[PDB]
């Protein structure tokens, strides 16, 4: 919540204004995503406090709407490097691994591999995710 609270959570980001604006634009359209500050521990055991977007995105499939839980972690160089993106299954969900999601929930898309500011942004990423996941569901009940 709140633009002021948001600016505070990204205070240590090199490109605060850009990150804030992209984030506002995302959560304006996608109201079940929310910005949170948490420590991310990388595979080498180092740790950084990063802002992430966490929540669900709506994905129509076979007549129903599936609210897929994701996490989009922004590196402190955002928006010049892409988010680290994960599907976060709940106890009622199994990951269906495939071209765009591995066994860990890591997401793979052309939008991420070809990421370049300013043409790439969070909103763009999310809509691509929704298109891809609508044809190739990353979870099942």
């Amino acid at each position: 919540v709140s633009e002021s609270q948001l600016k505070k959570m990204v205070s240590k980001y090199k490109y605060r204004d850009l990150t804030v604006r992209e984030t506002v634009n995302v959560i304006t359209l996608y109201k079940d995503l929310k910005p949170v500050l948490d420590s991310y521990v990388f595979n080498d055991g180092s740790s950084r406090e990063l802002m992430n977007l966490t929540g669900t995105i709506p994905v129509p499939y076979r007549g129903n709407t599936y609210n897929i839980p994701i996490c989009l972690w922004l590196l402190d160089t955002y928006p010049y490097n892409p988010p680290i993106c994960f599907v976060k299954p709940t106890s009622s969900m199994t990951i269906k691994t495939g071209k765009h999601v591995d066994a860990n929930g890591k997401i793979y898309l052309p939008y991420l591999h070809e990421w370049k500011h300013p043409q790439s942004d969070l909103l763009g990423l999310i809509q691509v995710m929704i298109v891809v996941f609508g044809d190739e569901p990353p979870v099942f009940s």
Binding site: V41, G45, A103
Partner: protein, 72 residues
Amino acid sequence: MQIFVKTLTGKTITLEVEPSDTIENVKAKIQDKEGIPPDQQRLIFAGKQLEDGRTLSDYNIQKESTLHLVLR
């Protein structure tokens, strides 16, 4: 179910686990496979350092997942 544990450099190793296994139980399985004592082990998954008391289930870690191991 099968999971994987990677260090930065080493060969990967495969473990047989169940969702009910604690992170401690996984560390005990690594100790049996490699000799490393559990208190020298940190296990990491998708941005989180896993906690000894919690289960694979609590983290929704599914089959074929890779955990990352770093040593004290």
